[PDB]
């Protein structure tokens, strides 16, 4: 019973692990370029706020507080980029695992959905970076510019930046899954309005899981999820 489902899973997990490793190798080869891409908005915001502060008066830059800091930041960036490059291979292998269980209609139900969701994730990441990150970074540096000196360390910044990008990708995806489920027909506006009582509890659970043990971070993460749920209700209503 479980013997073939463990042998095949073992082989597919092995191929996925090999893909992640090769992606990590390529990403560590180009880690200077990836780190430059990641840190470009931070440098731009620091220069802009330096100009603002110099105008007001008439410094801050990127730091490392550990050796493992810079080296591990390169390794972390390479690992994430490798996981991303392996994602087509991992997803195709998961599809190969799941496919003999789905019927013929479910196959065409799923595949275009996967392509559209991936496209929306990419659009969300690009939007996050190019639109959100400049203005948000400028605002957040300028918020503590007249009090504190911005000695921004790369170790926390890489995680912060990756969280922003991944979260915006997921935020672009969730409306699309709502619109898909509305088009095919599995949920209506009534379903999303009547399941909000449980949705909000699950949202706060997810916020606790995805944030440090502080309550304030939990609320700061739950608010976008509640807004996404409301936007989803609107989308399914107009469908």
């Amino acid at each position: 019973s479980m013997k073939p489902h463990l042998a095949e899973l073992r082989q597919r997990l092995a191929i996925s692990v090999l893909a992640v490793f090769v992606g990590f190798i390529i990403a560590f080869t180009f880690h200077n370029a990836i780190l430059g891409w990641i840190t470009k908005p931070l440098n731009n915001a620091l220069i802009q706020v330096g100009k603002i502060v110099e105008k007001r008066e008439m410094n801050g830059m990127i730091t490392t507080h550990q050796v493992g800091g810079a080296f591990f930041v390169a390794l972390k960036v390479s690992f994430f980029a490798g996981i991303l490059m392996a994602m087509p291979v991992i997803l195709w292998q998961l599809w190969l695992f799941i496919a003999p269980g789905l019927y013929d209609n479910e196959k065409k139900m799923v595949l275009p959905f996967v392509v559209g969701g991936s496209v929306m994730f990419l659009i969300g990441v690009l939007f996050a970076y190019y639109v959100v990150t400049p203005f948000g970074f400028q605002f957040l540096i300028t918020f503590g510019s007249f009090l504190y000196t911005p000695l921004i360390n790369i170790e926390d910044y890489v995680g912060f930046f990756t969280k922003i990008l991944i979260g915006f990708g997921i935020a672009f995806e969730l409306p699309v899954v709502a619109y898909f489920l509305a088009l095919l027909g599995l949920i209506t506006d009534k379903t999303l309005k009547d399941y909000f009582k449980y949705a909000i509890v699950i949202i706060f659970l997810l916020a606790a899981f995805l944030t440090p043990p502080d309550v304030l971070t939990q609320l700061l993460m739950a608010a976008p999820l509640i807004l996404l749920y409301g936007l989803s209700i609107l989308i399914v209503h107009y469908v």
């Binding site: 909000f196 009582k197 449980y198 909000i200 509890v201 706060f204 659970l205 916020a207 606790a208 899981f209 995805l210 944030t211 440090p212 043990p213 502080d214 309550v215 939990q218 609320l219």
Partner: protein, 44 residues
């Protein structure tokens, strides 16, 4: 418990009390208990 503090658990309980309320909170509790019992009997 996996980056989930005690205060975060209390906030989840607060949200559950506020939004589920006098009704559907006992219903949700009994549904969770039934799901846990089903899981226990399946893994037995």
């Amino acid at each position: 418990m996996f980056g989930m503090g005690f205060s975060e658990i209390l906030v989840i309980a607060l949200v559950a009390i506020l939004f589920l309320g006098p009704d559907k909170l006992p219903e949700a509790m009994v549904q969770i208990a039934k799901f846990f019992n089903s899981v226990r009997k399946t893994i037995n």
